[PDB]
Amino acid sequence: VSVSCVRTYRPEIKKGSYNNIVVHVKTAVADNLLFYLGSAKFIDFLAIEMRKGKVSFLWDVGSGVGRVEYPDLTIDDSYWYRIEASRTGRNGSISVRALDGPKASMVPSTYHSVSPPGYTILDVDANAMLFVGGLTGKIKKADAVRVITFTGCMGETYFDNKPIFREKEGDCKGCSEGTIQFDGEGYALVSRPIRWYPNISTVMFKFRTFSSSALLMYLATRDLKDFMSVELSDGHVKVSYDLGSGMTSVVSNQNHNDGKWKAFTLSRIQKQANISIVDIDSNQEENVATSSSGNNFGLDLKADDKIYFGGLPTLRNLRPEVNVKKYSGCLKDIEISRTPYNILSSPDYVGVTKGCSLENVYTVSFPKPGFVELAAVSIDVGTEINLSFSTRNESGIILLGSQAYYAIFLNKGRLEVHLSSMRKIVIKPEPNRFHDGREHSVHVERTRGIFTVQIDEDRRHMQNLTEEQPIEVKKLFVGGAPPNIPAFQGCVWNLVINSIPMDFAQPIAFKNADIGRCT
Ligand SMILES: *[C@@H]1O[C@H](CO)[C@@H](O)[C@H](O)[C@H]1NC(C)=O
Ligand SMILES: *[C@@H]1O[C@H](CO)[C@@H](O)[C@H](O)[C@H]1NC(C)=O
Ligand SMILES: *[C@@H]1O[C@H](CO)[C@@H](O)[C@H](O)[C@H]1NC(C)=O
Ligand SMILES: *[C@@H]1O[C@H](CO)[C@@H](O)[C@H](O)[C@H]1NC(C)=O
Ligand SMILES: [Ca+2]
Ligand SMILES: [Ca+2]
Ligand SMILES: [Ca+2]
Numbered sequence: 001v002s003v004s005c006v007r008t009y010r011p012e013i014k015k016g017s018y019n020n021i022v023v024h025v026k027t028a029v030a031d032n033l034l035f036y037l038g039s040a041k042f043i044d045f046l047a048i049e050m051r052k053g054k055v056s057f058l059w060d061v062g063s064g065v066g067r068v069e070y071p072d073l074t075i076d077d078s079y080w081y082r083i084e085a086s087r088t089g090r091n092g093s094i095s096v097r098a099l100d101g102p103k104a105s106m107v108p109s110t111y112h113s114v115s116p117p118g119y120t121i122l123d124v125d126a127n128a129m130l131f132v133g134g135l136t137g138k139i140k141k142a143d144a145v146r147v148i149t150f151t152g153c154m155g156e157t158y159f160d161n162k163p164i165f166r167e168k169e170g171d172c173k174g175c176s177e178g179t180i181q182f183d184g185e186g187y188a189l190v191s192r193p194i195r196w197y198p199n200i201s202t203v204m205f206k207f208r209t210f211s212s213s214a215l216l217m218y219l220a221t222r223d224l225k226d227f228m229s230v231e232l233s234d235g236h237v238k239v240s241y242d243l244g245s246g247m248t249s250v251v252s253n254q255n256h257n258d259g260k261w262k263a264f265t266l267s268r269i270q271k272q273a274n275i276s277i278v279d280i281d282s283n284q285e286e287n288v289a290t291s292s293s294g295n296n297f298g299l300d301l302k303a304d305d306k307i308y309f310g311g312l313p314t315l316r317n318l319r320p321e322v323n324v325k326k327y328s329g330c331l332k333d334i335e336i337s338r339t340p341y342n343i344l345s346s347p348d349y350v351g352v353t354k355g356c357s358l359e360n361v362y363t364v365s366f367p368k369p370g371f372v373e374l375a376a377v378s379i380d381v382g383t384e385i386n387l388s389f390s391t392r393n394e395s396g397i398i399l400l401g402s403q404a405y406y407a408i409f410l411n412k413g414r415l416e417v418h419l420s421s422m423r424k425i426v427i428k429p430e431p432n433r434f435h436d437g438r439e440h441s442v443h444v445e446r447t448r449g450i451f452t453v454q455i456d457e458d459r460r461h462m463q464n465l466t467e468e469q470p471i472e473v474k475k476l477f478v479g480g481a482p483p484n485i486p487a488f489q490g491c492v493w494n495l496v497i498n499s500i501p502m503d504f505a506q507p508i509a510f511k512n513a514d515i516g517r518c519t
Helices: none
Strands: 007-010 018-027 032-038 045-051 052-061 065-069 082-090 091-098 111-114 129-132 151-153 167-169 180-191 202-207 214-220 228-232 236-242 247-255 261-268 272-279 284-289 308-309 328-337 339-340 351-356 363-365 372-373 383-391 396-401 405-411 414-420 423-427 440-446 450-455 461-464 476-478 490-497 509-511
Touching: 007 018, 018 045, 045 082, 052 082, 052 091, 065 091, 111 450, 202 228, 214 328, 236 261, 236 272, 247 272, 247 284, 272 490, 308 328, 383 396, 383 405, 396 490, 414 440, 414 450, 423 461
Parallel strands: none
Antiparallel strands: 007 129, 007 167, 018 082, 018 151, 032 045, 032 129, 045 052, 052 065, 065 111, 082 091, 091 111, 180 308, 180 328, 180 351, 202 261, 202 328, 214 228, 214 308, 228 236, 236 247, 261 272, 272 284, 328 339, 363 490, 372 476, 372 509, 383 440, 383 490, 396 405, 396 476, 405 414, 414 423, 440 450, 450 461
């Protein structure tokens, strides 16, 4: 990038019969001198310029001027363009490619023209001069060139298939995948795209989750007559919509909450709709189609109606057939009505984190004081408990069941373990703390008349428990639980009780649980 100032260079011509010049330009001015090559001894010259917004390549190899203009485009709208011209004897070509903008999707063509018959070599003396974006008074421009200034910014210049200041006159100077993760406590909105066309819908976004019941997307009119939703149902992707004449809904044959990225695509044309789910790695694709009932053809979403993702806020009204359960999982490449959206650019979303981190369903982590409720499990004679944790908060409950109860918890550095129906063990760390942010594995085994605990293979403590009746509880928790000791903060994983691995795929409840990884 270079604004304002003229940049002169001394070219190196390899083939006198061939020329190739590449320039990147960006301006709002209709007339400019983009490239120029000439010398003091010869009239010969090369030049790339614009007239009324059109790029023209002109030259004179000693027998008269040759000019070829690119008609397909006009480049004075401030987008970046790649202008490439070349010469073969008296034959010149011009080609323009827009790097961005509404023209960037065009297919760059190539027009040719020729200079008068005769000479064919680009003559130049020793002190040749190649100017970029303007002209220096050290050389007299060819009459054919009418404007010698340049208002804008120039890009990488290539001359004779090689990159390119001998003299710098003037004061020179330079010039949305949106991957997100929801953890069951957020939502996000997107205003309706102006490109929204009522009788044709187009929805795309990639998702990756372990959730079986969630809301992925929902939109509706103020009256609820017309709406559309995309949710997870038992792991399957389910689509529902009503255009005002009657609702319909399809559920995929396969479930897609395997932790892998999936590509979702909906295409509705009036009452008909094609849903497509693709496992991005294996490239396998599923296809399910459905049709709304009646005569209405449009999803008449209005100017002020919002489109939500991952969850919803509290709404006065809400379509009765949709599962609004907050979504836990990642999202990205959201596109609606041909319009891309980046939730992170949104100003009113809640409980969303940039990126994606989903490792397994046996790991959980708490950012803020939170908890995860698991199905009750009682400790009987012969029972074991194995888990791993890593917090930096001396005081925090790690495990807990519900008179009777059991618990593994850090206490001002100490790691208590309680059993009752009340005996308990308390290990004081030595040579290293527990809430030291690094891995730590606990082991607890209640046998006859005794119970044991052992952290990261050290002194397996012991304690009496002359009872045989199994200590049963009503609820089981990881991280903490609803009600006086501080909250737990770090992550717990690979929880095993009575030989059964305890996953967090779908907890009975939770609050501020970043299930799936150790943040
Ligand atoms: C100039 O070159 C192009 C391609 O190399 C060719 O299509 C065109 O006919 C040439 N001009 C003429 C007529 O010599
Ligand atoms: C659905 O897909 C079929 C091809 O599988 C196509 O012919 C039809 O036009 C599509 N209709 C839509 C986009 O609803
Ligand atoms: C969209 O569908 C409606 C029926 O719901 C129809 O009356 C209307 O003409 C369609 N829009 C157009 C003009 O394509
Ligand atoms: C727990 O640790 C976090 C940092 O991991 C800290 O911000 C917070 O204040 C701590 N909470 C308590 C109860 O000390
Ligand atoms: Ca010549
Ligand atoms: Ca309607
Ligand atoms: Ca309608």
